[PDB]
């Protein structure tokens, strides 16, 4: 894994590589859970054998990252895409396209499992035998400065997503639920627009 | 409008006509809002120029209606499909396919409107200039007996759905949101399976 640290936006070279990539792993770190009035601190992208950690500041509107997020020709893989894409769509006024989610896949595969088993850490252990440390999850991500410990945590949160997705995708195919999962993925851009306009669940009364 | 009253299941002639129809309007009446342990009292279907009201009894498992609901080659139009398909999927152990919803279309078109405007009665008035009377909505639908007033209400709840859908579909095309609406429709079979297995919102944490 080739780790790069950036600020303000993704580099043009990595934007180009992302457009040619099969899959782009994506995660964010934030001020908290407040997608409306909070702040994105980092974007971490896994592009090929590279992981890029982009440190963001107050009122950053990264054009390269938003163009990538909005590009329907680039497949983005998240763990719990709803959280990340809602934060980015609202904070950047960005329309995300071509989105996939390992947590949604886990839930469609095993809907009656205990809720905790769908979290990234247990899911990585159960699916790939990979152990990650979530200790820095609740650190302060929005100061424009990263510690080495934060960098390690940020890389670990994104670097396994493409492999996790590929394994979960295979499990969905084996069970005959991949089309169902893909129908959930195709609704994600609609879901987040509804969120921004105040419809919290279009399927509720 | 040619109205027919049936019991137990849809007639074979109407099942055949439904398979050749562009659209099939569908509504149900029930014991209440309890889709898990309640009871379906009627199914009302709009097939061509016909409306069929099928009166159902305790523990009815209508094979013809479930086959139609599960047939991906038959386009069903509901108003608030989530309510109806969840009731039918749970009560009949049926897998619904190829579903559309005038309420979801209304919400994607006008997500910031007052919630009441998405109800069938105001939506029919605003879109088609049609007035319906909802007085019999909260009657007792599960006794195996229908009054003439209940029959009139049941017909009115389904007979305008194909026209309402066509008008809303045109509005979605004009605004450029039809693909978004169709992505919501394609998630409905996944949504209801998740509901039955206890995932109330796969997009929540």
Residue numbers in the entry:
A (entry chain A), B (entry chain A): 2 to 206
What did the published study say regarding this structure?
Dinucleases of the DEDD superfamily, such as oligoribonuclease, Rexo2 and nanoRNase C, catalyze the essential final step of RNA degradation, the conversion of di- to mononucleotides. The active sites of these enzymes are optimized for substrates that are two nucleotides long, and do not discriminate between RNA and DNA. The active sites invariably consist of (i) a catalytic DEDDh/y-containing core for divalent cation coordination and catalysis, (ii) a leucine residue that wedges between the two bases of the substrates and (iii) a 5′-phosphate cap that coordinates the 5′ phosphate of the dinucleotides. Here, we identified a novel DEDD subfamily, members of which function as dedicated deoxydinucleases (diDNases) that specifically hydrolyze single-stranded DNA dinucleotides in a sequence-independent manner.
To understand the molecular basis for the specificity of dimeric NrnC homologs toward DNA substrates, we determined a set of crystal structures of diDNases: (i) a complex of diDNaseNoc with dpGG to 1.55 Å and (ii) diDNase from Rhodococcus (diDNaseRho) in its apo state (1.72 Å resolution) and in complex with dpGG (2 Å resolution). In both structures, the 5′ phosphate of dpGG forms a set of salt bridges and hydrogen bonds with the side chains of conserved residues K104, H80 and Y206, the latter of which is contributed by the second protomer, and the main-chain nitrogen of L121 (per diDNaseNoc residue numbering). The side chain of Y206 also forms a π–π stacking interaction with the 5′ base of dpGG. In diDNaseNoc-dpGG, the side chain of the conserved residue Ser120 engages in another hydrogen bond with the 5′ phosphate, whereas in diDNaseRho-dpGG, it points away from the phosphate. Additionally, L34 splays the two bases of the substrate apart in the same manner as leucine wedges in dinucleases NrnC and Orn. In the diDNaseNoc-dpGG structure, the C-terminus of protomer B is pushed deeper into the active site of protomer A than that observed in the NrnCBh-pGG structure, creating relatively less space for the 5′ end of the substrate. In NrnCBh-pGG, the side chain of residue H205 forms a moderately strong hydrogen bond with a distance of 2.9 Å with the ether oxygen of the 5′ ribose, while in diDNaseNoc-dpGG the side chain of Y206 repulses the ether oxygen of 5′ deoxyribose, pushing the entire nucleotide away. Coordination of the ether oxygen in diDNaseNoc-dpGG is restored by the side chain of residue H81, which donates a hydrogen from the other side of the substrate. The third discriminatory feature is the apparent restricted movement of the side chain of F84 in diDNaseNoc, which engages in a perpendicular T-shaped stacking with the benzene ring of F88. However, mutating F88 to an isoleucine residue alone or in combination with H81F/Y206H in diDNaseNoc resulted in significant loss of DNase activity without an increase in activity on diribonucleotides.
